[PDB]
Amino acid sequence: SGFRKMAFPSGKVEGCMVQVTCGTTTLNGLWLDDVVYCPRHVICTSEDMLNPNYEDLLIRKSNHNFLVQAGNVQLRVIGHSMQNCVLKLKVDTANPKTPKYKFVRIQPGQTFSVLACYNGSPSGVYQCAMRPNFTIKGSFLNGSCGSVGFNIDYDCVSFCYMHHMELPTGVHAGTDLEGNFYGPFVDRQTAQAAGTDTTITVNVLAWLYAAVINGDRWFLNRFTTTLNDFNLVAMKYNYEPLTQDHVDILGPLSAQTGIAVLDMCASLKELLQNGMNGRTILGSALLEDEFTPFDVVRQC
Amino acid sequence: SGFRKMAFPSGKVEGCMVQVTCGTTTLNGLWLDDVVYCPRHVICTSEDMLNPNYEDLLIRKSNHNFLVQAGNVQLRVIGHSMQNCVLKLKVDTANPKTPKYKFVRIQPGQTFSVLACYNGSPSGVYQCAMRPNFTIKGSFLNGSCGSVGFNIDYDCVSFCYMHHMELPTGVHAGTDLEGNFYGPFVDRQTAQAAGTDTTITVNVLAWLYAAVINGDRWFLNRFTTTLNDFNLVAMKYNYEPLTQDHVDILGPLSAQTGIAVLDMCASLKELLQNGMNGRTILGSALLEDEFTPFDVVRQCSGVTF
Ligand SMILES: O=C(Nc1cncc2ccccc12)[C@@H]1CNCc2ccc(Cl)cc21
Ligand SMILES: O=C(Nc1cncc2ccccc12)[C@@H]1CNCc2ccc(Cl)cc21
Ligand SMILES: [Cl-]
């Protein structure tokens, strides 16, 4: 029993964290096999940042301009290339701690663990979700760029996020490990704003099933709803539309608890209408949306 | 910016997790140097759990009865002894991945990271607090016994908790790494209940400072209070008493934000008597008490390990 916001054990990723320095800029890199992946903005100066021409800045660099430190050992850079917004630094040593890995691009609503690092040193691990507006509500200070988001399945690490920047609202933007940004963001200090954030409906429903599995049924009701009537109500509370894919995904949890997805959708509509009335669900006074249906099945 | 429930990086502890199987029971062990530490209830089965004489059950076990698996390698047990509610299995091989470590007993209100394991394999890491009633609101299923709680200070891992059991309310009970239970609990299948819990006041204040550091000031007010008047209010809302030690501990956060500890106490008093009024603090509608003052400073300063 119990339900916690739980991160994947970070050990497999800790052994990949390195410090990357180019001039006065220092940030984190991910050392996998003989390549160090890091944000390409490590080649920018604080002023260059408004309209950098990364191809122009990169062509002016040599392998020896990149200082890569793995613990107390300096790695030798023997090549460099740019793939979208990530810089790939070929090094002369394969990381002996390289786990079985994959690069996966995730969709909004997906969750992942973040290993927050400063100067190539892991400082903390927390759990995140890719918001529907493609930002992440992380906890990052200056120097955290290059910190990565990941999931572990079996002994395989799926790297899904690399931290690049903080937006004016305090939320974070980054790329997959192929350098493609999540969201309409660019690695430039130009005026950029996150779109209106919405609640991840499928995740809230999954969390309501987790509460039912943990013995909490107070919020249930005798009502059901159509998918269209649910979405009409959900939209008014800034909740993401629930698609038939989401309904299908909740099938296992619906079968396990005996509560049909549209029956749970009706409990959610009523919770949005009434609030919680001094009650909590799984120790929370708000509806939690950073647990996917997969996380719930895995943890419960 | 941002404030998350953040655990210590678990890598140093992952390299210590092993599977311990004795009879029909399989649980987790902590392999440090040439010793595997695990709950002593691994020697128990069905009849045993009811009324267990652990000295009697342990004396009949041979070393070869404890199957210890470290990854895909079986460790050889060359000795066994019991220290309080923890079983120590002497093995022939020192763990080459043994980090710099200490065994520390923590006090209620102190936080730690838990590396939840099943079959000697780490499955998740989460941050939690030792409640004032000595339970932990963890997330544990069957097979999680032997999972450990820890903090990291520089390069030294301080092991502070070993998971032993789940109480009927879904909360968890365990021991320090010397086998002494936190709380009035015993490792036996019997009627046991967690006492009425209280809110960790110093931790709520620390979290209010974290909210101020992150730009949330709506709850601040012009008022201050005496420590005695605050404690009279706090006792009414099942909040732990705030001592002068707590006030001193919050000094750095008070100096950083310009909000005196007793000034933040008057904010807490108004929040307790009036509520949040539809507003949230750091994305929460409840007052969070599982971040210590040190946790807030560490996260808002970026300390690495
Ligand atoms: O955002 C950035 N860094 C940070 C990243 N994360 C959390 C921070 C918190 C506090 C200060 C900085 C933080 C850098 C620097 N500031 C502008 C900028 C513009 C574009 C790009 Cl791609 C990177 C950056
Ligand atoms: O509590 C225990 N294990 C667990 C531990 N954590 C979370 C669980 C969740 C669900 C089932 C078991 C769980 C064991 C088994 N039940 C009786 C018992 C009595 C005494 C002792 Cl010391 C251990 C135990
Ligand atoms: Cl480093």
Side-chain angles (χ1 to χ4, degrees), chain A residues 1 4 7 10-11 14 122-123 125 137-140 166 172 290 298-299, chain B residues 1-2 4 7 10-11 14 123-125 127 137 139-140 166 290 299 303 305:
Chain A
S1 315
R4 279 266 177 196
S10 59
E14 289 169 53
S123 60
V125 62
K137 290 186 181 164
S139 174
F140 290 123
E166 183 169 295
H172 305 100
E290 302 206 345
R298 179 172 200 272
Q299 180 174 175
Chain B
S1 310
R4 280 271 179 205
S10 57
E14 289 170 54
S123 60
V125 62
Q127 187 77 356
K137 291 185 181 165
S139 178
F140 291 122
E166 183 169 293
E290 304 204 348
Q299 184 171 170
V303 170
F305 315 92

PDB file of all heavy atoms in Angstrom, chain A residues 1 4 7 10-11 14 122-123 125 137-140 166 172 290 298-299, chain B residues 1-2 4 7 10-11 14 123-125 127 137 139-140 166 290 299 303 305:
ATOM      1  N   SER A   1       0.816  -1.213   0.000  1.00  0.00           N
ATOM      2  CA  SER A   1       0.000   0.000   0.000  1.00  0.00           C
ATOM      3  C   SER A   1       0.852   1.267   0.000  1.00  0.00           C
ATOM      4  O   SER A   1       2.080   1.220   0.196  1.00  0.00           O
ATOM      5  CB  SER A   1      -0.996   0.018   1.162  1.00  0.00           C
ATOM      6  OG  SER A   1      -1.650  -1.229   1.320  1.00  0.00           O
ATOM      7  N   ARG A   4       3.262   7.063  -3.839  1.00  0.00           N
ATOM      8  CA  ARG A   4       4.222   8.133  -3.813  1.00  0.00           C
ATOM      9  C   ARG A   4       4.629   8.518  -5.204  1.00  0.00           C
ATOM     10  O   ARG A   4       4.657   7.695  -6.116  1.00  0.00           O
ATOM     11  CB  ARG A   4       5.478   7.643  -3.085  1.00  0.00           C
ATOM     12  CG  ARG A   4       5.366   7.698  -1.589  1.00  0.00           C
ATOM     13  CD  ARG A   4       5.948   9.005  -1.162  1.00  0.00           C
ATOM     14  NE  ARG A   4       5.851   9.229   0.269  1.00  0.00           N
ATOM     15  CZ  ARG A   4       6.007  10.413   0.854  1.00  0.00           C
ATOM     16  NH1 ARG A   4       6.260  11.495   0.126  1.00  0.00           N
ATOM     17  NH2 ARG A   4       5.908  10.524   2.173  1.00  0.00           N
ATOM     18  N   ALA A   7      10.612   8.237  -8.406  1.00  0.00           N
ATOM     19  CA  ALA A   7      11.531   8.345  -9.529  1.00  0.00           C
ATOM     20  C   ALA A   7      12.228   7.001  -9.752  1.00  0.00           C
ATOM     21  O   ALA A   7      12.230   6.155  -8.864  1.00  0.00           O
ATOM     22  CB  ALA A   7      12.558   9.439  -9.266  1.00  0.00           C
ATOM     23  N   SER A  10      18.529   6.311  -9.979  1.00  0.00           N
ATOM     24  CA  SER A  10      19.349   7.107 -10.879  1.00  0.00           C
ATOM     25  C   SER A  10      20.768   6.635 -11.164  1.00  0.00           C
ATOM     26  O   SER A  10      21.441   7.269 -11.957  1.00  0.00           O
ATOM     27  CB  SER A  10      19.428   8.532 -10.358  1.00  0.00           C
ATOM     28  OG  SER A  10      19.992   8.518  -9.054  1.00  0.00           O
ATOM     29  N   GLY A  11      21.216   5.581 -10.513  1.00  0.00           N
ATOM     30  CA  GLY A  11      22.566   5.039 -10.643  1.00  0.00           C
ATOM     31  C   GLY A  11      23.088   4.860 -12.049  1.00  0.00           C
ATOM     32  O   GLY A  11      24.219   5.265 -12.351  1.00  0.00           O
ATOM     33  N   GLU A  14      23.724   8.373 -13.310  1.00  0.00           N
ATOM     34  CA  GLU A  14      24.825   9.036 -12.594  1.00  0.00           C
ATOM     35  C   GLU A  14      26.200   8.715 -13.186  1.00  0.00           C
ATOM     36  O   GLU A  14      27.039   9.601 -13.315  1.00  0.00           O
ATOM     37  CB  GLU A  14      24.829   8.627 -11.128  1.00  0.00           C
ATOM     38  CG  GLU A  14      23.691   9.215 -10.335  1.00  0.00           C
ATOM     39  CD  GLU A  14      23.610   8.567  -8.969  1.00  0.00           C
ATOM     40  OE1 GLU A  14      24.639   8.540  -8.254  1.00  0.00           O
ATOM     41  OE2 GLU A  14      22.517   8.068  -8.619  1.00  0.00           O
ATOM     42  N   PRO A 122      25.750  14.807 -10.018  1.00  0.00           N
ATOM     43  CA  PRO A 122      24.323  14.656  -9.702  1.00  0.00           C
ATOM     44  C   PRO A 122      24.008  15.203  -8.323  1.00  0.00           C
ATOM     45  O   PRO A 122      24.733  14.931  -7.373  1.00  0.00           O
ATOM     46  CB  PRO A 122      24.105  13.145  -9.783  1.00  0.00           C
ATOM     47  CG  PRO A 122      25.261  12.644 -10.649  1.00  0.00           C
ATOM     48  CD  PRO A 122      26.401  13.499 -10.208  1.00  0.00           C
ATOM     49  N   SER A 123      22.974  16.016  -8.225  1.00  0.00           N
ATOM     50  CA  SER A 123      22.591  16.602  -6.951  1.00  0.00           C
ATOM     51  C   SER A 123      21.242  16.117  -6.433  1.00  0.00           C
ATOM     52  O   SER A 123      21.016  16.130  -5.223  1.00  0.00           O
ATOM     53  CB  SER A 123      22.601  18.114  -7.049  1.00  0.00           C
ATOM     54  OG  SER A 123      21.687  18.510  -8.047  1.00  0.00           O
ATOM     55  N   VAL A 125      17.322  13.735  -7.633  1.00  0.00           N
ATOM     56  CA  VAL A 125      16.479  13.049  -8.578  1.00  0.00           C
ATOM     57  C   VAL A 125      15.030  13.320  -8.225  1.00  0.00           C
ATOM     58  O   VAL A 125      14.657  13.313  -7.046  1.00  0.00           O
ATOM     59  CB  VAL A 125      16.820  11.548  -8.712  1.00  0.00           C
ATOM     60  CG1 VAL A 125      16.619  10.806  -7.392  1.00  0.00           C
ATOM     61  CG2 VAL A 125      15.996  10.903  -9.822  1.00  0.00           C
ATOM     62  N   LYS A 137       7.704  21.163 -15.419  1.00  0.00           N
ATOM     63  CA  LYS A 137       7.755  21.939 -14.181  1.00  0.00           C
ATOM     64  C   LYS A 137       8.873  21.287 -13.392  1.00  0.00           C
ATOM     65  O   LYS A 137       8.641  20.322 -12.672  1.00  0.00           O
ATOM     66  CB  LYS A 137       6.423  21.870 -13.439  1.00  0.00           C
ATOM     67  CG  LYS A 137       5.327  22.630 -14.164  1.00  0.00           C
ATOM     68  CD  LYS A 137       4.054  22.652 -13.325  1.00  0.00           C
ATOM     69  CE  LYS A 137       2.947  23.388 -14.035  1.00  0.00           C
ATOM     70  NZ  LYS A 137       1.621  23.103 -13.418  1.00  0.00           N
ATOM     71  N   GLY A 138      10.096  21.715 -13.659  1.00  0.00           N
ATOM     72  CA  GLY A 138      11.251  21.108 -13.014  1.00  0.00           C
ATOM     73  C   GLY A 138      11.738  21.919 -11.841  1.00  0.00           C
ATOM     74  O   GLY A 138      11.062  22.843 -11.368  1.00  0.00           O
ATOM     75  N   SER A 139      12.902  21.567 -11.365  1.00  0.00           N
ATOM     76  CA  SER A 139      13.545  22.298 -10.295  1.00  0.00           C
ATOM     77  C   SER A 139      14.960  22.387 -10.758  1.00  0.00           C
ATOM     78  O   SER A 139      15.716  21.409 -10.684  1.00  0.00           O
ATOM     79  CB  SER A 139      13.443  21.545  -8.973  1.00  0.00           C
ATOM     80  OG  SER A 139      14.197  22.232  -7.987  1.00  0.00           O
ATOM     81  N   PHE A 140      15.294  23.529 -11.348  1.00  0.00           N
ATOM     82  CA  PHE A 140      16.585  23.707 -11.960  1.00  0.00           C
ATOM     83  C   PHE A 140      17.128  25.094 -11.679  1.00  0.00           C
ATOM     84  O   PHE A 140      16.410  26.080 -11.803  1.00  0.00           O
ATOM     85  CB  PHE A 140      16.444  23.576 -13.478  1.00  0.00           C
ATOM     86  CG  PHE A 140      16.133  22.219 -14.062  1.00  0.00           C
ATOM     87  CD1 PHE A 140      15.018  22.034 -14.857  1.00  0.00           C
ATOM     88  CD2 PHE A 140      17.014  21.163 -13.911  1.00  0.00           C
ATOM     89  CE1 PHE A 140      14.784  20.814 -15.483  1.00  0.00           C
ATOM     90  CE2 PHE A 140      16.767  19.939 -14.514  1.00  0.00           C
ATOM     91  CZ  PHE A 140      15.663  19.782 -15.322  1.00  0.00           C
ATOM     92  N   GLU A 166      15.216  27.840 -18.986  1.00  0.00           N
ATOM     93  CA  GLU A 166      14.103  28.179 -18.132  1.00  0.00           C
ATOM     94  C   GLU A 166      13.352  29.341 -18.775  1.00  0.00           C
ATOM     95  O   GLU A 166      13.968  30.345 -19.142  1.00  0.00           O
ATOM     96  CB  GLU A 166      14.570  28.585 -16.729  1.00  0.00           C
ATOM     97  CG  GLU A 166      13.391  28.876 -15.818  1.00  0.00           C
ATOM     98  CD  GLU A 166      13.757  29.014 -14.357  1.00  0.00           C
ATOM     99  OE1 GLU A 166      14.201  28.006 -13.758  1.00  0.00           O
ATOM    100  OE2 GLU A 166      13.598  30.128 -13.806  1.00  0.00           O
ATOM    101  N   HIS A 172      10.394  24.865 -17.535  1.00  0.00           N
ATOM    102  CA  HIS A 172      11.579  24.477 -18.244  1.00  0.00           C
ATOM    103  C   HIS A 172      11.300  23.901 -19.599  1.00  0.00           C
ATOM    104  O   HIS A 172      10.246  23.317 -19.839  1.00  0.00           O
ATOM    105  CB  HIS A 172      12.399  23.526 -17.350  1.00  0.00           C
ATOM    106  CG  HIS A 172      12.700  24.152 -16.020  1.00  0.00           C
ATOM    107  ND1 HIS A 172      11.961  23.839 -14.893  1.00  0.00           N
ATOM    108  CD2 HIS A 172      13.537  25.176 -15.723  1.00  0.00           C
ATOM    109  CE1 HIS A 172      12.426  24.618 -13.929  1.00  0.00           C
ATOM    110  NE2 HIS A 172      13.384  25.433 -14.381  1.00  0.00           N
ATOM    111  N   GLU A 290       0.515  13.859 -12.634  1.00  0.00           N
ATOM    112  CA  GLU A 290       1.852  13.449 -13.080  1.00  0.00           C
ATOM    113  C   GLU A 290       2.113  11.957 -12.784  1.00  0.00           C
ATOM    114  O   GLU A 290       3.253  11.561 -12.522  1.00  0.00           O
ATOM    115  CB  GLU A 290       2.974  14.394 -12.579  1.00  0.00           C
ATOM    116  CG  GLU A 290       2.739  15.839 -13.029  1.00  0.00           C
ATOM    117  CD  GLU A 290       3.936  16.774 -13.179  1.00  0.00           C
ATOM    118  OE1 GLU A 290       5.013  16.426 -12.654  1.00  0.00           O
ATOM    119  OE2 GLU A 290       3.805  17.853 -13.810  1.00  0.00           O
ATOM    120  N   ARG A 298       2.419  -0.005 -12.544  1.00  0.00           N
ATOM    121  CA  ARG A 298       3.761  -0.334 -12.062  1.00  0.00           C
ATOM    122  C   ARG A 298       3.913  -0.195 -10.521  1.00  0.00           C
ATOM    123  O   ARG A 298       4.477  -1.072  -9.869  1.00  0.00           O
ATOM    124  CB  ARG A 298       4.803   0.536 -12.794  1.00  0.00           C
ATOM    125  CG  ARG A 298       6.227   0.296 -12.357  1.00  0.00           C
ATOM    126  CD  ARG A 298       7.276   1.016 -13.205  1.00  0.00           C
ATOM    127  NE  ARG A 298       8.585   0.378 -13.028  1.00  0.00           N
ATOM    128  CZ  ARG A 298       9.458   0.704 -12.080  1.00  0.00           C
ATOM    129  NH1 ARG A 298       9.221   1.730 -11.274  1.00  0.00           N
ATOM    130  NH2 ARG A 298      10.605   0.045 -11.972  1.00  0.00           N
ATOM    131  N   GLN A 299       3.393   0.895  -9.947  1.00  0.00           N
ATOM    132  CA  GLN A 299       3.543   1.162  -8.521  1.00  0.00           C
ATOM    133  C   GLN A 299       2.514   0.448  -7.621  1.00  0.00           C
ATOM    134  O   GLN A 299       2.857   0.035  -6.516  1.00  0.00           O
ATOM    135  CB  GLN A 299       3.543   2.679  -8.272  1.00  0.00           C
ATOM    136  CG  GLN A 299       3.698   3.031  -6.810  1.00  0.00           C
ATOM    137  CD  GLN A 299       3.845   4.491  -6.516  1.00  0.00           C
ATOM    138  OE1 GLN A 299       3.876   4.866  -5.360  1.00  0.00           O
ATOM    139  NE2 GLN A 299       3.964   5.352  -7.524  1.00  0.00           N
TER     140      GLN A 299
ATOM    141  N   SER B   1      14.612  27.972 -10.906  1.00  0.00           N
ATOM    142  CA  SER B   1      13.298  27.928 -10.266  1.00  0.00           C
ATOM    143  C   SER B   1      12.695  26.528 -10.276  1.00  0.00           C
ATOM    144  O   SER B   1      13.138  25.639 -11.002  1.00  0.00           O
ATOM    145  CB  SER B   1      12.340  28.921 -10.921  1.00  0.00           C
ATOM    146  OG  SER B   1      12.926  30.207 -11.024  1.00  0.00           O
ATOM    147  N   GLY B   2      11.675  26.357  -9.461  1.00  0.00           N
ATOM    148  CA  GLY B   2      10.995  25.090  -9.312  1.00  0.00           C
ATOM    149  C   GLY B   2      11.312  24.501  -7.963  1.00  0.00           C
ATOM    150  O   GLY B   2      12.362  24.792  -7.370  1.00  0.00           O
ATOM    151  N   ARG B   4      10.672  20.674  -6.185  1.00  0.00           N
ATOM    152  CA  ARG B   4      10.200  19.322  -6.305  1.00  0.00           C
ATOM    153  C   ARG B   4      10.582  18.529  -5.090  1.00  0.00           C
ATOM    154  O   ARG B   4      11.600  18.792  -4.467  1.00  0.00           O
ATOM    155  CB  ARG B   4      10.874  18.670  -7.517  1.00  0.00           C
ATOM    156  CG  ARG B   4      10.243  19.033  -8.822  1.00  0.00           C
ATOM    157  CD  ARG B   4       9.145  18.043  -9.141  1.00  0.00           C
ATOM    158  NE  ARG B   4       8.491  18.388 -10.406  1.00  0.00           N
ATOM    159  CZ  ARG B   4       7.249  18.043 -10.724  1.00  0.00           C
ATOM    160  NH1 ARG B   4       6.499  17.362  -9.863  1.00  0.00           N
ATOM    161  NH2 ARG B   4       6.741  18.384 -11.900  1.00  0.00           N
ATOM    162  N   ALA B   7      14.829  13.379  -4.164  1.00  0.00           N
ATOM    163  CA  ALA B   7      15.579  12.390  -3.435  1.00  0.00           C
ATOM    164  C   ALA B   7      17.076  12.532  -3.753  1.00  0.00           C
ATOM    165  O   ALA B   7      17.447  13.174  -4.737  1.00  0.00           O
ATOM    166  CB  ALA B   7      15.089  11.002  -3.837  1.00  0.00           C
ATOM    167  N   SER B  10      20.561   7.829  -6.095  1.00  0.00           N
ATOM    168  CA  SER B  10      20.569   6.514  -5.440  1.00  0.00           C
ATOM    169  C   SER B  10      21.678   5.536  -5.827  1.00  0.00           C
ATOM    170  O   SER B  10      21.715   4.446  -5.281  1.00  0.00           O
ATOM    171  CB  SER B  10      19.225   5.828  -5.667  1.00  0.00           C
ATOM    172  OG  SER B  10      18.987   5.722  -7.054  1.00  0.00           O
ATOM    173  N   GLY B  11      22.511   5.901  -6.787  1.00  0.00           N
ATOM    174  CA  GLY B  11      23.577   5.060  -7.316  1.00  0.00           C
ATOM    175  C   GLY B  11      24.452   4.364  -6.295  1.00  0.00           C
ATOM    176  O   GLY B  11      24.689   3.159  -6.409  1.00  0.00           O
ATOM    177  N   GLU B  14      22.279   1.647  -4.778  1.00  0.00           N
ATOM    178  CA  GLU B  14      21.940   0.591  -5.737  1.00  0.00           C
ATOM    179  C   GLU B  14      23.009  -0.512  -5.813  1.00  0.00           C
ATOM    180  O   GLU B  14      22.670  -1.696  -5.861  1.00  0.00           O
ATOM    181  CB  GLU B  14      21.740   1.189  -7.123  1.00  0.00           C
ATOM    182  CG  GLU B  14      20.480   2.001  -7.235  1.00  0.00           C
ATOM    183  CD  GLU B  14      20.446   2.760  -8.538  1.00  0.00           C
ATOM    184  OE1 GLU B  14      20.590   2.124  -9.605  1.00  0.00           O
ATOM    185  OE2 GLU B  14      20.251   3.994  -8.495  1.00  0.00           O
ATOM    186  N   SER B 123      13.795  -0.558  -7.711  1.00  0.00           N
ATOM    187  CA  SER B 123      12.700  -0.262  -8.622  1.00  0.00           C
ATOM    188  C   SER B 123      12.286   1.190  -8.609  1.00  0.00           C
ATOM    189  O   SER B 123      11.684   1.645  -9.573  1.00  0.00           O
ATOM    190  CB  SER B 123      11.492  -1.135  -8.297  1.00  0.00           C
ATOM    191  OG  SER B 123      11.094  -0.848  -6.969  1.00  0.00           O
ATOM    192  N   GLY B 124      12.559   1.903  -7.522  1.00  0.00           N
ATOM    193  CA  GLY B 124      12.168   3.298  -7.430  1.00  0.00           C
ATOM    194  C   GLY B 124      12.839   4.013  -6.292  1.00  0.00           C
ATOM    195  O   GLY B 124      13.304   3.381  -5.352  1.00  0.00           O
ATOM    196  N   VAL B 125      12.887   5.323  -6.365  1.00  0.00           N
ATOM    197  CA  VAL B 125      13.466   6.130  -5.328  1.00  0.00           C
ATOM    198  C   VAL B 125      12.502   7.249  -5.017  1.00  0.00           C
ATOM    199  O   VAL B 125      11.950   7.867  -5.923  1.00  0.00           O
ATOM    200  CB  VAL B 125      14.917   6.619  -5.631  1.00  0.00           C
ATOM    201  CG1 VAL B 125      14.968   7.501  -6.875  1.00  0.00           C
ATOM    202  CG2 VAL B 125      15.518   7.345  -4.418  1.00  0.00           C
ATOM    203  N   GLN B 127      11.434  10.403  -1.828  1.00  0.00           N
ATOM    204  CA  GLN B 127      11.802  11.157  -0.660  1.00  0.00           C
ATOM    205  C   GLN B 127      10.630  11.132   0.311  1.00  0.00           C
ATOM    206  O   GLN B 127       9.461  11.142  -0.100  1.00  0.00           O
ATOM    207  CB  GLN B 127      12.189  12.591  -1.073  1.00  0.00           C
ATOM    208  CG  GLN B 127      12.748  13.457   0.030  1.00  0.00           C
ATOM    209  CD  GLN B 127      14.175  13.169   0.394  1.00  0.00           C
ATOM    210  OE1 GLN B 127      14.824  12.230  -0.113  1.00  0.00           O
ATOM    211  NE2 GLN B 127      14.699  13.981   1.308  1.00  0.00           N
ATOM    212  N   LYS B 137       5.217   7.419   5.500  1.00  0.00           N
ATOM    213  CA  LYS B 137       4.150   7.267   4.524  1.00  0.00           C
ATOM    214  C   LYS B 137       4.879   6.861   3.259  1.00  0.00           C
ATOM    215  O   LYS B 137       5.226   7.711   2.464  1.00  0.00           O
ATOM    216  CB  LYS B 137       3.379   8.577   4.374  1.00  0.00           C
ATOM    217  CG  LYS B 137       2.574   8.913   5.624  1.00  0.00           C
ATOM    218  CD  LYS B 137       1.719  10.147   5.419  1.00  0.00           C
ATOM    219  CE  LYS B 137       0.927  10.523   6.644  1.00  0.00           C
ATOM    220  NZ  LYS B 137       0.398  11.913   6.527  1.00  0.00           N
ATOM    221  N   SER B 139       5.747   3.856  -0.031  1.00  0.00           N
ATOM    222  CA  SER B 139       5.042   3.207  -1.110  1.00  0.00           C
ATOM    223  C   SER B 139       5.751   1.899  -1.224  1.00  0.00           C
ATOM    224  O   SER B 139       6.868   1.840  -1.753  1.00  0.00           O
ATOM    225  CB  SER B 139       5.161   4.002  -2.401  1.00  0.00           C
ATOM    226  OG  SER B 139       4.487   3.273  -3.416  1.00  0.00           O
ATOM    227  N   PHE B 140       5.165   0.870  -0.627  1.00  0.00           N
ATOM    228  CA  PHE B 140       5.803  -0.427  -0.542  1.00  0.00           C
ATOM    229  C   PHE B 140       4.814  -1.550  -0.742  1.00  0.00           C
ATOM    230  O   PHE B 140       3.730  -1.535  -0.160  1.00  0.00           O
ATOM    231  CB  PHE B 140       6.399  -0.608   0.857  1.00  0.00           C
ATOM    232  CG  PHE B 140       7.591   0.230   1.257  1.00  0.00           C
ATOM    233  CD1 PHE B 140       7.534   1.056   2.366  1.00  0.00           C
ATOM    234  CD2 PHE B 140       8.803   0.100   0.599  1.00  0.00           C
ATOM    235  CE1 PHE B 140       8.664   1.734   2.808  1.00  0.00           C
ATOM    236  CE2 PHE B 140       9.921   0.809   1.017  1.00  0.00           C
ATOM    237  CZ  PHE B 140       9.853   1.598   2.135  1.00  0.00           C
ATOM    238  N   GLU B 166       4.274  -3.114   7.016  1.00  0.00           N
ATOM    239  CA  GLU B 166       3.200  -2.180   6.747  1.00  0.00           C
ATOM    240  C   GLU B 166       2.146  -2.332   7.828  1.00  0.00           C
ATOM    241  O   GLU B 166       1.703  -3.441   8.105  1.00  0.00           O
ATOM    242  CB  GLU B 166       2.555  -2.443   5.383  1.00  0.00           C
ATOM    243  CG  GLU B 166       1.482  -1.422   5.063  1.00  0.00           C
ATOM    244  CD  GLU B 166       0.998  -1.468   3.634  1.00  0.00           C
ATOM    245  OE1 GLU B 166       1.800  -1.148   2.726  1.00  0.00           O
ATOM    246  OE2 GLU B 166      -0.180  -1.836   3.416  1.00  0.00           O
ATOM    247  N   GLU B 290       7.284  17.672   4.418  1.00  0.00           N
ATOM    248  CA  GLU B 290       8.345  16.680   4.207  1.00  0.00           C
ATOM    249  C   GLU B 290       9.580  17.289   3.502  1.00  0.00           C
ATOM    250  O   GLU B 290      10.296  16.602   2.772  1.00  0.00           O
ATOM    251  CB  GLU B 290       7.830  15.389   3.540  1.00  0.00           C
ATOM    252  CG  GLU B 290       6.693  14.770   4.350  1.00  0.00           C
ATOM    253  CD  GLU B 290       6.430  13.278   4.211  1.00  0.00           C
ATOM    254  OE1 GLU B 290       6.991  12.660   3.280  1.00  0.00           O
ATOM    255  OE2 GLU B 290       5.675  12.723   5.046  1.00  0.00           O
ATOM    256  N   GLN B 299      18.363  22.317  -2.063  1.00  0.00           N
ATOM    257  CA  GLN B 299      17.703  22.390  -3.362  1.00  0.00           C
ATOM    258  C   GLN B 299      17.753  23.791  -3.976  1.00  0.00           C
ATOM    259  O   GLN B 299      17.934  23.933  -5.188  1.00  0.00           O
ATOM    260  CB  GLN B 299      16.266  21.884  -3.254  1.00  0.00           C
ATOM    261  CG  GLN B 299      15.566  21.856  -4.601  1.00  0.00           C
ATOM    262  CD  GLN B 299      14.218  21.172  -4.618  1.00  0.00           C
ATOM    263  OE1 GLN B 299      13.500  21.264  -5.617  1.00  0.00           O
ATOM    264  NE2 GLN B 299      13.845  20.458  -3.540  1.00  0.00           N
ATOM    265  N   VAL B 303      23.369  21.816  -4.246  1.00  0.00           N
ATOM    266  CA  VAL B 303      24.468  21.024  -3.676  1.00  0.00           C
ATOM    267  C   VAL B 303      24.587  19.693  -4.441  1.00  0.00           C
ATOM    268  O   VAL B 303      23.571  19.060  -4.683  1.00  0.00           O
ATOM    269  CB  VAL B 303      24.233  20.799  -2.154  1.00  0.00           C
ATOM    270  CG1 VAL B 303      25.204  19.776  -1.580  1.00  0.00           C
ATOM    271  CG2 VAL B 303      24.304  22.119  -1.385  1.00  0.00           C
ATOM    272  N   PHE B 305      26.513  15.644  -5.292  1.00  0.00           N
ATOM    273  CA  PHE B 305      27.050  14.423  -4.666  1.00  0.00           C
ATOM    274  C   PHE B 305      27.620  13.482  -5.738  1.00  0.00           C
ATOM    275  O   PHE B 305      28.599  13.830  -6.403  1.00  0.00           O
ATOM    276  CB  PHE B 305      25.959  13.679  -3.840  1.00  0.00           C
ATOM    277  CG  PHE B 305      25.129  14.594  -2.974  1.00  0.00           C
ATOM    278  CD1 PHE B 305      23.946  15.137  -3.448  1.00  0.00           C
ATOM    279  CD2 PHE B 305      25.592  15.011  -1.738  1.00  0.00           C
ATOM    280  CE1 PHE B 305      23.234  16.056  -2.691  1.00  0.00           C
ATOM    281  CE2 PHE B 305      24.869  15.918  -0.976  1.00  0.00           C
ATOM    282  CZ  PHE B 305      23.700  16.437  -1.459  1.00  0.00           C
TER     283      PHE B 305
END
